[PDB]
């Protein structure tokens, strides 16, 4: 017949390599398709839907885990104190694990693009206030006071008829992509720190509660991409199922 030769790479089974394979059933014809609403074509339009961020993840909320979604604001006695602080990278273990962006970034290794963080006020109609939300590029720890944290990319938000505000976390990096940050050598890919502060106080009249809560949402922008699919760390199988 035709003279051939066998190179290396013969009789191996590579899992991620597509090819033609022999069918079992000649002459089959599947069931015709029906128009079902809500078809996806890409994983990038699930990473744009915003989900709740667990900023208030303390060790005392492990017994009543519904407290972990809302962090409080209240009437302050001193001017310029801070309310919360957390890191701004979706791969690291922290507040971003509860989002659909933080779970789909897990399956991939490197990411790119800018994010967004949407805060929503859930107080009464008669309570007013102003708060400062700042984002700090890497190189430092949590800032010590309000006069230091305002040098970053910040926004000033007041409570009115529109209850929400949006802080974009712009893509400031040296490399084109970023692997997942981690303690050790992989702190080179850190993103920054988001802290919110008190611009003015939380003023309330007579006959209204003096503690309100804030929900924080998070999504991705248009230029968000991911690559290098891998395995995830969030599911374990110690013993067999069933």
């Amino acid at each position: 017949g035709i003279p051939t030769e066998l190179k290396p790479g013969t009789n191996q089974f590579l899992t991620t390599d597509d090819g033609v394979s022999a069918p079992i059933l000649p002459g089959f014809h599947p069931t015709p398709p029906i128009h079902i609403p809500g078809e996806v074509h890409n994983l990038l339009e699930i990473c744009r839907v915003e989900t709740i961020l667990e900023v208030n993840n303390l060790k005392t909320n492990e017994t009543t885990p519904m407290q972990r979604l809302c962090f409080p604001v209240s009437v302050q006695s001193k001017t310029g104190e801070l309310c919360a602080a957390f890191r701004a990278d979706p791969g690291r273990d922290g507040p971003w694990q509860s989002t659909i962006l933080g779970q789909l970034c897990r399956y991939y290794t490197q990411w790119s693009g800018s994010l967004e963080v949407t805060f929503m006020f859930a107080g009464s109609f008669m309570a007013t206030g102003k708060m400062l939300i700042a984002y700090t590029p890497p190189g430092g720890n949590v800032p010590a006071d309000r006069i230091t944290a305002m040098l970053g990319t910040h926004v000033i938000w007041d409570f009115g008829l529109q209850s929400s505000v949006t802080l974009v976390v712009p893509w400031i990096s040296n490399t084109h992509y970023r692997a997942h940050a981690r303690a050790g050598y992989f702190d080179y890919y850190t993103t920054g720190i988001i802290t919110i502060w008190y611009q003015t106080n939380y003023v309330v009249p007579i006959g209204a509660p003096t503690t309100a809560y804030i929900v924080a949402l998070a999504a991705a922008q248009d230029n968000f991409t991911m690559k290098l699919c891998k395995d995830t760390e969030d599911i374990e199988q110690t013993a067999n199922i069933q």
Partner: antibody, heavy 115, light 101 residues
């Protein structure tokens, strides 16, 4: 180690003035309000007012307005209080506190009598 | 806002578990302090925020208050002196006093 040190006792004529001083040492003198508390010898406490030595704004009680004047020297770390037109009601002891909140550290106390 | 501290001149006996009460008039929102004073001395602030202790104070003092009526309790006596109370919600006002035996 915060230290608040006052002056000594005074014997004053009715109708004259007096200047009590309070000296702070051991911490940053600015960025902290300084309070003055009056205690007439038989009964409880009364709040006179406060002073912010960073710029110099002062809040007073309603009754003690145009009786007391609060001033603060930022360089010498000393806050003064001057009382004017003294009468025999104002024989008391005056303290020096520091929080703007709930009066963390207190002074020793200066006894003022008038006769 | 006027603080009452309606009871003075109490009677204790050396481990008697006394409690001291005061009430405000217009809804102070748990912003009290409790101020033990000895004779011939400056007062010391035993508690801040109506629940929280400072450093160096032994943990036999404890305070609480539900809506308007606030309490201060001692467990093992001797600790004899005059006790005041002070709100900081609009302007600092003090209480009357509480002498013990």
């Amino acid at each position: 180690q915060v230290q608040l040190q006052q002056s000594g006792p005074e014997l004053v004529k009715p109708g004259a003035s007096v200047k009590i001083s309070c000296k702070a040492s051991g911490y940053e003198f600015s960025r902290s309000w300084m309070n003055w508390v009056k205690q007439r010898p038989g009964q409880g406490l009364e709040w006179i007012g406060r002073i912010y030595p960073g710029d110099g704004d002062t809040n007073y009680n309603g009754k003690f307005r145009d009786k007391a004047t609060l001033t603060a020297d930022k360089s010498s770390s000393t806050a003064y209080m001057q009382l004017s037109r003294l009468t025999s009601v104002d024989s008391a002891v005056y303290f020096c506190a520091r929080r703007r909140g709930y009066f963390d550290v207190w002074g020793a106390g200066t006894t003022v009598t008038v006769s | 806002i006027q603080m009452t501290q309606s009871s003075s001149y109490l009677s204790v006996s050396l481990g008697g578990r006394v409690t001291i009460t005061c009430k405000a008039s217009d809804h102070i929102n748990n912003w009290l302090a409790w101020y033990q004073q000895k004779p011939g001395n400056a007062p010391r602030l035993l508690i801040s925020g109506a629940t929280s202790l400072e450093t160096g104070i032994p943990s036999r003092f404890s305070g609480s208050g539900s809506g308007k009526d606030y309490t201060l309790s001692i467990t093992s006596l001797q600790d004899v002196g005059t006790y005041y109370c002070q709100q900081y919600w609009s302007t600092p006002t003090f209480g009357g006093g509480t002498k013990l035996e």
